[PDB]
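Lab notebook, design round three. We kept the backbone fixed and only want residue identities now. Task for the bench partner: fill in a sequence for the structure below.
Input structure tokens:
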């Protein structure tokens, strides 16, 4: 089984995939985020945030209210399963999480908290 994924967020405000699969045998899973391009984090920074699909809008709303000062996430938001730091071009960050925090029948989504239009699904498979 493959228990990690490499994902890119670019200067054009896009991730390079809209779907991540976590093999059901994985006990931990690592997301390796990078930022091709040349725009720095104070212009086009990206992170990677994981919640259930049902919780995404709520996380975004409360994140918006929390602002730039908090990378647009409510600190300690229990709905946020895992998240990376905000990165600019040429920078990278990885986050690892316990797959026990995921459930087989539930739908998850990942997104950038700075640019909530940048999103995709994450599924146990
Ligand atoms: Cu972003």
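Proposed sequence:
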């Amino acid at each position: 089984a493959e228990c990690s994924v490499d994902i890119q967020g670019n200067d054009q405000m896009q991730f390079n995939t809209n779907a991540i699969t976590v093999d059901k045998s994985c006990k931990q899973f690592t997301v390796n985020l990078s930022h091709p391009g040349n725009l720095p984090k104070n212009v086009m920074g990206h992170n990677w945030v994981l919640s259930t699909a049902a919780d995404m809008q709520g996380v975004v709303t409360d994140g918006m209210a929390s602002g730039l000062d908090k990378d647009y996430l409510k600190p300690d938001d229990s709905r946020v399963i895992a998240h990376t730091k905000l990165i600019g071009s040429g920078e990278k960050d990885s986050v690892t999480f316990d797959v026990s925090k995921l459930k087989e029948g539930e739908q998850y989504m990942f997104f950038c908290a700075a640019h909530a239009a940048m999103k995709g699904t994450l599924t146990l498979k």
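Keep this in mind before ordering anything: The CA atoms of residues 63 and 106 lie 23 Å apart.
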